[PDB]
Amino acid sequence: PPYTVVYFPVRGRCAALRMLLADQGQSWKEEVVTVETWQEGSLKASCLYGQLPKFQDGDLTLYQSNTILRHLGRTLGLYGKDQQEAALVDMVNDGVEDLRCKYISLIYTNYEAGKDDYVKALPGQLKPFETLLSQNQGGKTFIVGDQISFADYNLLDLLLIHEVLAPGCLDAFPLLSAYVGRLSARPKLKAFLASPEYVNLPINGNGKQ
Amino acid sequence: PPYTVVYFPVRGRCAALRMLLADQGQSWKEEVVTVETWQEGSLKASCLYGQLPKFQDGDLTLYQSNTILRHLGRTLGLYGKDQQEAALVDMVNDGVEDLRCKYISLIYTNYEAGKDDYVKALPGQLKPFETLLSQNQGGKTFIVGDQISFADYNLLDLLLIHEVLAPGCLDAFPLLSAYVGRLSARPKLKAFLASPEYVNLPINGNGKQ
Ligand SMILES: N[C@@H](CCC(=O)N[C@@H](CSC(=S)NCCc1ccccc1)C(=O)NCC(=O)O)C(=O)O
Ligand SMILES: N[C@@H](CCC(=O)N[C@@H](CSC(=S)NCCc1ccccc1)C(=O)NCC(=O)O)C(=O)O
Ligand SMILES: N[C@@H](CCC(=O)N[C@@H](CS)C(=O)NCC(=O)O)C(=O)O
Ligand SMILES: [Ca+2]
Ligand SMILES: [Ca+2]
Ligand SMILES: [Ca+2]
Ligand SMILES: [Ca+2]
Ligand SMILES: [Ca+2]
Ligand SMILES: [Ca+2]
Ligand SMILES: [Ca+2]
Ligand SMILES: [Ca+2]
């Protein structure tokens, strides 16, 4: 396969770029890193920022999940039609990353005490994406413009894991709800989402979701 | 001016994009939002993600500091020479963002008790950028390729504020040390760094640095 994903045995920060690769009909190898292998120390010391994922595209080696998304966006043409749309795509993805950071903080450092405060705050955090949809062809296509972008895959992942965290959290947002149904139904993506290599991984690395 | 920056009266997440604009000979307007105006709520409610900075380039309104950097990178030609370099620029900026998030967490939530632990870990956090320099023309040009990129401006800001937090922290890193001196001496940037509109703002908004 032309691509390699090196990551822990979780969906985590690779879920979106995997969806992107599958949906775009690309093949890739998964190199799995166990917690035991990681704690040995050598792989970690060879990573630019001491962390995974690590990504190989031919002889190009990348770290940083959003760097990989943007690289795939750039090279597969999933980055809007012009500089104006590209800025909007970035704006969406940066918003997705901000909420992803908050989600990761809850999961790994404060799940038990923090969950209901997080869920009470969640509608306010999702609304900006509903508003973006409302402003683009009535929410009937994609988050930016009329072609899919890397930001769509990242947003879709974020929505999917929040429905697991808080089932029904999207019920107050008709555009986001139809959007999730619509993108998920894209044939290659639907098949990937139902496959063992997706379904049989946990969302996070600590048993929580 | 063709650009407007709407922000709190701090350097914060606007320092890099201001350095970029100044160094690239651009003019721009500063629209300042006081804590009192922000508390009133109406401006905040109008912001896409409820936060600043807000950036205007003509009738294009952007939110998210790194979206603004990437936008200016794209439109002003500070994004590498090809697709591979663009990926590397992204990789650097995402690394800078990660450390900035840690820096901000320290400053605003845990400065008193957490500073010693932060400073101890700091060499491990700066080494990646030294390594990147060592692999690009002996560290004698820019963080990626032969021309300046938006990532350089963000890295430069990150380095400057860490020298204030922990004076001498760059002493162990020859290439980053020389890099800071070299970019700081670029004529338009040198002038900006010495101007009241930079010098008379605090780095952060809580009195700590
Ligand atoms: N900005 C980076 C973040 C990479 C990252 O957080 N990687 C994690 C895995 S990805 C993820 S969703 N993990 C949850 C957050 C976490 C961070 C650090 C330790 C444990 C959990 C990792 O490698 N941890 C091991 C280590 O730091 O030694 C990116 O987007 O790729
Ligand atoms: N990902 C965004 C982050 C924007 C951001 O954090 N804006 C802060 C200002 S920028 C900064 S460096 N502030 C320090 C961190 C902070 C965050 C939230 C509240 C207070 C301080 C803000 O608007 N706070 C007001 C509010 O949320 O009501 C970006 O990069 O632009
Ligand atoms: N063309 C330059 C830089 C431009 C660039 O990086 N473009 C990316 C920025 S992440 C993009 O959004 N391209 C979308 C488009 O061409 O519409 C290169 O290949 O280095
Ligand atoms: Ca495979
Ligand atoms: Ca396309
Ligand atoms: Ca609680
Ligand atoms: Ca429903
Ligand atoms: Ca001005
Ligand atoms: Ca250039
Ligand atoms: Ca301490
Ligand atoms: Ca020195």
Numbering used by the authors:
A (entry chain B), B (entry chain A): 1 to 209
Sentences from the study reporting this entry:
Glutathione S-transferases (GST) are involved in the metabolism of PEITC by catalyzing its conjugation with glutathione (GSH). As phase II detoxification enzymes, cytosolic GSTs exist and function as stable homo- or heterodimers. The dimer is required to maintain the functional conformations at the GSH-binding site and xenobiotic substrate-binding site in each subunit. Here, we report the crystal structures of hGSTP1 and hGSTA1 in complex with GS-PEITC (hGSTP1:GS-PEITC and hGSTA1:GS-PEITC, respectively).
We determined the crystal structures of the hGSTA1:GS-PEITC and hGSTP1:GS-PEITC complexes at 1.93- and 1.95-Å resolution, respectively. The structures show that the orientation of the phenethyl moiety of the conjugate was significantly different in the two GST enzymes. In the hGSTP1:GS-PEITC structure, however, it points toward the solvent channel, stacking with the hydrophobic side chains of Ile104 and Tyr108. The binding pocket for the phenethyl moiety of GS-PEITC in hGSTP1 can accommodate more diverse and bigger ligands than that in hGSTA1. Unlike hGSTA1 that contains only one cysteine residue, hGSTP1 contains four (Cys14, Cys47, Cys101, and Cys169). High-resolution MS showed that the modification of these cysteine side chains by PEITC resulted in multiple species of modified hGSTP1 proteins, including 1-, 2-, 3, and 4-Cys adducts. Therefore, unmodified and many species of modified hGSTP1 proteins were present in the crystal lattice at the same time, none of which was as abundant as could be revealed by observable electron density. As expected, the hGSTP1:GS-PEITC structure did not show any modified cysteine side chain. Among the four cysteine pairs in the hGSTP1 dimer, only the Cys101 pair is located in the solvent channel at the subunit interface. Because the solvent channel becomes much narrower near the bottom, there is not enough room for the covalent modifications of both Cys101 side chains at the same time.
